[PDB]
């Protein structure tokens, strides 16, 4: 059905991205960022999107540049994939937990970008992943997607659980919005 394909090439990065909204949950990501792939594999698995990401970047500097241009790419792919937005639910709201974590995501494929981020992560790094990037990821994805997106933390100690549960609750909500409403 609905597939979005973007190939962006900056000085800093090389990003190839393919999203099927009406997928079966196929996860095939290789960004050079081990933890970000794991989050994108959740995105596929939990909202049954098919996600094909393939990137190569400044990883020697920071993770910052690659994190960002993948995120911007995914949002542009999301926009092309929704087409003219004919009869989709459009809104989606799901609270998913992971053990002690409990994350709430409400969103709306509005056309006007906004990221409400209320998410305190107590450690500065999960694996090698700078933990400030999760915010940056979602910001960049929202800015090209045109997606109004609030994310709210109700509970959580463990930083791995917190980001995983967020991506779990973002996927299930995103599907809810991409699916077709019997209008």
Residues in the annotated binding site for substrate: 12, 38-46, 64-68, 90, 112, 160-168
Our CB check for a copy of itself shows the closer of 77 and 107 to be: 107
Is there binding between residue 9 and a copy of itself (CB under 8 A)?
no
Among candidates 163, 138, 143, which has minimal Cα distance to 153?
163
Is there binding between residue 68 and Mn ion (CB under 5 A)?
yes
95: left (phi over 0), alpha (psi -120 to 50) or beta: beta
- H-state helical runs in the chain: 34-46, 64-82, 133-145, 159-178
Is there binding between residue 18 and a copy of itself (CB under 8 A)?
no
Q: Give 63's strand partners.
A: none
**Separation of alpha carbons 82 and 6, rounded Å:** 14
Q: Scanning residues 36 to 95, which ones bind a copy of itself (CB under 8 A)? A: 37-38, 48, 58, 60-64, 91, 93-95
β-bridge pairing 14-20 and 125-126: unpaired
Is there binding between residue 69 and Mn ion (CB under 5 A)?
no
Q: Scanning residues 85 to 144, which ones bind a copy of itself (CB under 8 A)? A: 91, 93-100, 102, 104, 106-108, 110, 112-114, 116, 122-127, 130, 132, 135-136, 140, 143
> Residue count at the site for Mn ion (CB under 5 A)?
2
């Amino acid at each position: 059905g609905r597939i979005g394909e973007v190939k962006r090439v900056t000085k800093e990065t090389n990003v190839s991205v393919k999203i099927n909204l009406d997928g079966t949950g196929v996860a095939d990501s290789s960004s050079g960022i081990p933890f970000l792939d794991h989050m994108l594999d959740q995105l596929a698995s939990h909202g049954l999107f098919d996600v094909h990401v393939r990137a190569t970047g400044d990883v020697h500097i920071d993770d910052h540049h690659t994190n960002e241009d993948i995120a911007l790419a995914i949002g542009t792919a999301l926009l092309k994939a929704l087409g003219e937005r004919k009869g989709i639910n459009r809104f989606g709201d799901f609270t998913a937990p992971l053990d002690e974590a409990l994350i709430h995501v409400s969103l709306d494929l509005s056309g006007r970008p906004y990221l409400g981020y209320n998410l305190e992560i107590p450690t500065q790094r999960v694996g090698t992943y700078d933990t400030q990037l999760v915010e940056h990821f979602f910001q960049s994805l929202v800015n090209t997607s045109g997606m109004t997106l609030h994310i709210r933390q109700l509970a959580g100690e463990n930083s791995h659980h917190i980001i995983e549960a967020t991506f779990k609750a973002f996927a299930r909500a995103l599907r809810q919005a991409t699916e077709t409403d019997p209008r």
